[PDB]
């Protein structure tokens, strides 16, 4: 059978998704996750469909930006594999992390 080398399909996926702009979280789980969290402050809140799309645009971008910052810290420890220690770092410099 046919078999690409580890990394090969990882490259094509990068190129494939960097190219596009469409959301890569499933909008339902997200909504439930947004609702679930929304409750903690006050229960029984209604959300415009733009409001849950507003958050899902904000979050997906922030994280794609975090994975850029994170991928450098990893290459900067001479590695290719991103890790916890990289997202912790990125956030620390960023000052999101005390």
């Amino acid at each position: 059978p046919h078999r690409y080398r580890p990394g090969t399909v990882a490259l094509r996926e990068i190129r494939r998704y960097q190219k596009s702009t469409e959301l890569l979280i499933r909008k339902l789980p997200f909504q439930r996750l947004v609702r679930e969290i929304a409750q903690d402050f006050k229960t029984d809140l209604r959300f415009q469909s733009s409001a849950v799309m507003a958050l899902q645009e904000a979050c997906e971008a922030y994280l794609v930006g975090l994975f850029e910052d994170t991928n450098l810290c990893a290459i900067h420890a001479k590695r290719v594999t991103i890790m916890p220690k990289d997202i912790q770092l990125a956030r620390r410099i960023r000052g999101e992390r005390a």
Binding site: G7, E36, I37, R46, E68, I82, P84
Partner: protein, 87 residues
Amino acid sequence: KRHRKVLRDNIQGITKPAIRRLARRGGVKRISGLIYEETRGVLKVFLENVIRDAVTYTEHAKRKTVTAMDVVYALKRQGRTLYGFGG
């Protein structure tokens, strides 16, 4: 009053292949395991911090419905301003 729905734990709804696609766009070629629940930690703190602020906006405006526009006055306040949902 009250009606159908009380909370749940959608945290695990962030499929591994979902976080993987974010990182693939974020230029990442290889991803540790410890990654996917690490991200679930941060993403959760993000929304808590946005939605706290957005909920604070709705409560000023004495609505029960959170708008698109409540999210935006908060997201900007949290220096992450968004174009494509008014304001």
